[PDB]
């Protein structure tokens, strides 16, 4: 019930000295724009 409040998305926790920033951001963008996220949603949302 009700409406969404304090709408904030999730994220991947990292560290300031970790050199895996771009290599993870590009993977996330690939998953988003290549339908991987859509497939995961379809396989994990709207069960009934």
């Amino acid at each position: 019930t009700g409406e969404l409040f304090f709408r904030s998305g999730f994220g991947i926790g990292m560290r300031k000295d970790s050199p895996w920033k771009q290599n993870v951001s590009l993977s996330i963008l690939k998953s988003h724009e290549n339908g991987f996220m859509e497939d995961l949603d379809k396989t994990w949302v709207r069960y009934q």
Binding site: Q22, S25, L26, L29, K30, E33
Partner: protein, 38 residues
């Protein structure tokens, strides 16, 4: 190197992220179509 900060409607894309950085998005959008009823 002709400016510092760019403000506008620039969707985050891989083909643009390798030459310029981006901050945390504040507005969510996407791709959609609009069809009339009658």
């Amino acid at each position: 190197q002709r400016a510092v900060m760019a403000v506008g409607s620039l969707t985050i894309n891989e083909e643009r992220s390798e030459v310029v950085d981006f901050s945390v998005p504040f507005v969510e959008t996407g791709i959609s179509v609009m069809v009339s009823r009658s």
